[PDB]
Paper text:
Responding to this critical need, we introduce here a fully automated method for collecting, selecting, and merging data from hundreds to thousands of in meso-grown microcrystals. This approach boosts the collective phasing signal of many tiny crystals to a level where de novo phasing of highly challenging membrane protein targets becomes not only possible but also fast and high-throughput. We refer to it as the in meso in situ serial crystallography—experimental phasing (IMISX-EP) method. IMISX-EP has three components: (1) in meso crystallization (and in situ soaking where appropriate), (2) fast, automated grid scanning, and serial data collection in situ, and (3) real-time data processing and selection of data sets followed by structure solution.
We demonstrated the IMISX-EP approach for both heavy atom derivatization methods with two membrane proteins, BacA and PgpB. Indeed, BacA is the first de novo structure solved by the IMISX-EP method. BacA crystals were derivatized by in situ soaking with HgCl2 in IMISX wells directly. From the 968 BacA crystals identified, two groups were created with which to evaluate two phasing methods. One contained 360, the other 271 data sets. The first group was used successfully for SAD phasing with SHELXD and CRANK2. Another advantage is the ease with which heavy atom and ligand-soaking experiments can be performed in true in situ fashion without ever touching the crystals, which remain suspended in the viscous mesophase.
Residue numbers in the entry: 4 to 76, 86 to 216, 224 to 273
The structure:
């Protein structure tokens, strides 16, 4: 009776922490450990429900995503070249270091990426310019998009919260918190869709239906609130929250 309940608990977690700088992978290992869902099947299940979070960004940015690829229906406009430049370096670094990255998945490394990721969010807050260089999404430049991407190499460290890494570099390149968040979401669509496909390949029954779907729903609510929320809130509360999670990763496993 609780196979569906566990998937609901894991789904609301994944959908919530996927696009918030709070280390989706870190929350899953602690909750999966507290529940007892730790087998290889759990990891496969977790990659599946990541697809639901993807579709949430797909439906949230349906008009803009297809716009980048030519399916329409400041005066600049964000182009597909921005997305490509944002994902070139992580792909190149991710392809070359696959066996090495997969070795970093122990919980101790998550504890550090939780702390170090929070330090970076603080440094982005203290160091970001007073006047944003790109207050809107369509104001971004190829240099900002690429520097954000070369900054996404850190997300290959398990527990770093790819959103937190991507948004930090956005703020440090002069992109507003709102646009830096919008770009991290749009950038996650090609990244997650390809990465999960890459993970679904090497890993091979209705428990997915609950998890995939409920993660799609919660992500929509979180991703819509967070964008409206971040208009008036900083990333300091998120960075400090990652420290409380880091102690928990130590608490649950050590
Ligand atoms: C009192 C309740 C909270 C208890 C936990 C205390 C947090 C201390 C932990 C780590 C250091 C964090 C460094 C402090 C963050 C920077 C403070 C700040 O003012 O940020 C600058 C601003 O965001 C841009 O101008
Ligand atoms: C990735 C590794 C993580 C390492 C963590 C680094 C931690 C704190 C750096 C804080 C730097 C604080 C510098 C203070 C400068 C300042 O106060 O602002 C200057 C000006 O406002 C600029 O626009
Ligand atoms: C669109 C992305 C969907 C990914 C699905 C996928 O890659 O599945 C792997 C394949 O089933 C391996 O047998
Ligand atoms: C499982 C919990 C997952 C993420 C919670 C992380 C939330 C940490 C940051 C919360 C910021 C916030 O909620 O601010 C709202 C405020 O009340 C408006 O004024
Ligand atoms: Hg890089």
């Amino acid at each position: 009776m609780h196979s569906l309940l566990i998937a609901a608990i894991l789904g609301v977690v994944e959908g919530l922490t996927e696009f918030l700088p709070v280390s989706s992978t870190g929350h899953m290992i602690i909750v999966g450990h507290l529940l007892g869902f730790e087998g290889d099947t759990a990891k496969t299940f977790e990659v599946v429900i990541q697809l639901g979070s993807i579709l949430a960004v797909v439906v949230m940015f349906w008009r803009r995503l297809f716009g980048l690829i030519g399916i329409h229906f400041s005066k600049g406009r964000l182009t597909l070249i921005h997305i490509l430049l944002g994902m070139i370096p992580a792909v190149v670094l991710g392809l070359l270091f696959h066996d090495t990255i997969k070795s970093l998945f122990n919980p101790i490394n998550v504890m550090y990426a939780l702390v170090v990721g929070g330090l970076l969010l603080i440094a982005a807050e203290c160091l970001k310019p007073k006047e944003p260089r790109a207050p809107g999404l369509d104001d971004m430049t190829y240099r900002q998009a690429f520097m954000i991407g070369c900054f996404q190499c850190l997300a290959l460290w398990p527990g770093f919260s790819r959103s937190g890494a991507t948004i930090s570099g956005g703020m440090l390149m002069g992109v507003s918190r709102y646009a830096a968040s919008e770009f991290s979401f749009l950038l996650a669509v090609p990244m997650m869709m390809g990465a999960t496909a890459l993970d679904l390949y090497k890993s091979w029954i209705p428990m997915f239906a609950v998890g995939f779907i409920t993660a799609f729903v919660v992500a929509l609510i979180a991703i819509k609130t967070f964008l409206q929320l971040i208009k008036r809130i900083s990333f300091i509360p998120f960075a400090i929250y990652r420290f409380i999670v880091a102690a928990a990763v130590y608490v649950v496993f050590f």
